[PDB]
Structure formats: C-alpha cells, structure tokens
C-alpha cells in the first residue's frame, strides 16, 4: 500500500526506460492517483 518501494524505471526495447512507477510489476495493479491517495492517508508526503 502506497509507494513504499523505491522507484526503478524498468527497461525494454522498441532500448527504453519507462519513467512511470506503475510500469513496475510491484505497482502494475494500481493507478498513480490510487497510490498517491494511499500515500496521503498514510501521511507519507
């Protein structure tokens, strides 16, 4: 819950780096806003 795992942009090919946290398999199941609201309610700002 919340962005408790430090951000690491995964690599790919098209080489690429996806600078979006939800591109990480740990996060892939939620949206930016969903994570942000969880970090706000944990007071993790």
């Amino acid at each position: 819950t919340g962005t408790t795992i430090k951000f690491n942009p995964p690599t790919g090919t098209d080489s690429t780096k996806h600078q979006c946290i939800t591109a990480m398999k740990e996060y892939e199941s939620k949206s930016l806003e969903e994570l942000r609201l969880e970090d706000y309610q944990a007071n993790r700002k």
């Binding site: 690429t16 996806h18 600078q19 946290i21 939800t22 591109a23 949206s31 969903e34 994570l35 700002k45």
Partner: protein, 328 residues
C-alpha cells in the same frame, strides 16, 4: 506562457473552462489540497480569482452545466457536489463507496443528468435534486477516465477495460472494445466527424502512447492507429491528458515529461512540441472556442512519493494557441 494568479497550493488534477453560454471565459481547477477554484479570464490574459469550494478529500474531476450556472466536483471523499455559482453555495448530489474519479454533464433531448465514475467500479447517473441515483451501471474494473459527447460516452477502467455507451432515451452499454493500448489507461477524449457527430476517441496510456479509435470506420486495421509521444535508452513518460481543439479537430496531449504537444490525427503529424518544464504537466483543456489553451504543471506521482517536493510551486499556464493547432 501566461501564469494564473493565485494558483492552488497542491498538485492540480483537472481543468475545465466554462460553456459558450457564459460571456467571457471562466476556468475551474481541481487540486490535491481538496479545493475547487474558479478564475475569471479576460482578453488581456489577466485572471481574477472569483470563488472557491472545498471537499474533505482531493478533487479528481470537474465540469460545468450546459447553461453555465453550475460547476460539478468529484472527489476522493466518495462524493460529488453541485456548486451553484450565483449563490456560491454547494451541495452534495452523488454518493459512492470509493473515490469519484470522473464527472460529466449529459444534456440529452429527453433528460439531463450528472454522470459519475468511481473506483468502486460503478457508473452512476444523477438528477441533482434526488438522493437516489436515477441509474446505476456496473463497470468491470475501476474507473480511470471518461468523456461525454451526446449520444456517446467512453469509459476506460483498470485491466485495460474500455466501454462505449449510447445515451439516447436512457444510457446503456453500446459495445466493449478490446483496448488498442497494451498498457495502463490514463486519459481519453472523444472527437467528432465533419458532420459534428461523435465518431471516435483518442486514448492515452502510461507508455508514451496515444491510440486513435473510430467506432465504425471502413477499414479498421488502417483507419485505427497508435502513435508514440512524450518520450525524450529512450525515456518513456505517462500521458496525463488529452483534448481536441473545439474548432480545428486537432488535439493536444500533456505528459509526465513536463511537455505538451499538438497533433493532427487526420494528417498523422506532430504540429508542435513545447520545451521541458520543471515538473510534469498534469492536466489541460480548451476554452469554449479554442482561443485559449490552459495546462497545469504539478507533480503527478509518476515516480512515487520520494520525488514529491511539497514546497514546489503549482502553475496553471494560459496560451492563446489557436493558430498553432490549425492544420494545413
């Protein structure tokens, strides 16, 4: 570009100019400090704070009523409000079991109502005076974004869900679409045909990609396509918003790269790409005639909490970019 005076204090999620029914131009912004703020805009580019209202939670979407008398607000506090601008009093009109992510006015020939779309995987329709939603429709997953242009609505959900609705007589599902995008859905915007009828939509993904989808084209494999955008090892940023110039039918995208870009989907060209801002561009929209392009520069969380600087300034910028979005 032109900066709006007295910007919100936290990150801005949504922007919405006023309908043609009001003389002049009034901008509305929703923010993560829980506020909805209304600025009057004047031909000089100067902007005047007029009024504010607050939710008990972050504000995710906002929109107007077609006559211009109301502003609608959808918030993480699981409600939406109707804000009467004259009296400057707001009341609750909608209740959900989760944050409300999207909000829209439906002006149909036989009925008018507010449509709210929630992370509680529901789609609710409200007459604005009853505590009872007039209609409730179930979503396969959590609502992430939507757009409305009678007689069509589009709604994207989590798990790449993508649904089209018909709004004639009463709203009802029209068709579920296998998403053209391979990654998480973030933004959507409906475009119209030469006869001014809704005809398709553009769909933004977190993977620096936008899809153009016609509902019923002759050759779908040729007529529908996806293009790359908002990339600088190539770095790939999320696409945070999308909007069609109301006159030219070209479009703008804004992404976590802190840039914005203009596009022509018929010619399949990139018309313009601005320079890099300090922060990601988290929203945008057009005034009623397209003479004003407004975008907001705020943190979007696309790199987690660690990169959130709460003392960095949140900016709404105005650009008179009508000519830049005309095609040839």
């Amino acid at each position: 570009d032109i900066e709006v005076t007295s910007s919100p204090d936290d990150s801005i999620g949504c922007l919405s100019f006023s309908p043609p029914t009001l003389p002049g131009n009034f901008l509305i912004a929703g923010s993560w400090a829980n506020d909805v703020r209304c600025w009057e805009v004047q031909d000089s580019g100067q902007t005047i704070p007029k009024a504010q209202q607050m939710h008990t939670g972050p504000v995710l979407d906002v929109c107007w009523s077609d006559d211009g008398s109301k502003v609608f607000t959808a918030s993480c506090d699981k409600t939406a409000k109707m804000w009467d601008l004259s009296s400057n009093q707001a009341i609750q009109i909608a209740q959900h079991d989760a944050p409300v992510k999207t909000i829209h006015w439906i002006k149909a020939p036989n009925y008018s109502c507010v449509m709210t779309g929630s992370w509680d995987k529901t789609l609710k329709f409200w007459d604005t005076r009853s505590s009872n939603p007039m209609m409730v429709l179930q979503l396969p997953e959590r609502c992430y974004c939507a757009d409305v242009i009678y007689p069509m609505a589009v709604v994207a959900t989590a798990e790449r869900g993508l649904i089209v609705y018909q709004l004639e007589n009463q709203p009802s599902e029209f068709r579920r679409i296998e998403s053209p995008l391979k990654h998480q859905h973030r933004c959507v915007a409906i475009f119209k045909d030469k006869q001014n009828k809704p005809t398709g939509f553009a769909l933004g993904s977190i993977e620096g990609r936008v899809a153009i989808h016609y509902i019923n084209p002759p050759n779908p494999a040729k007529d529908n396509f996806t293009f790359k955008c908002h990339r600088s090892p190539q770095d790939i940023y999320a696409v945070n918003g999308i909007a069609f110039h109301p006159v030219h039918g070209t479009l703008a995208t804004v992404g976590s790269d802190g840039r914005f870009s203009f596009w022509d989907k018929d010619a399949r060209t990139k018309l313009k790409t601005s320079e890099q801002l300090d922060q990601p561009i988290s929203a945008c929209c057009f005034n009623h005639n397209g003479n004003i392009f407004a975008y907001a520069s705020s943190y979007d969380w696309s790199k987690g909490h660690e990169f959130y600087n709460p003392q960095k300034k949140n900016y709404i910028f105005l650009r008179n970019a009508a000519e830049e979005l005309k095609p040839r």
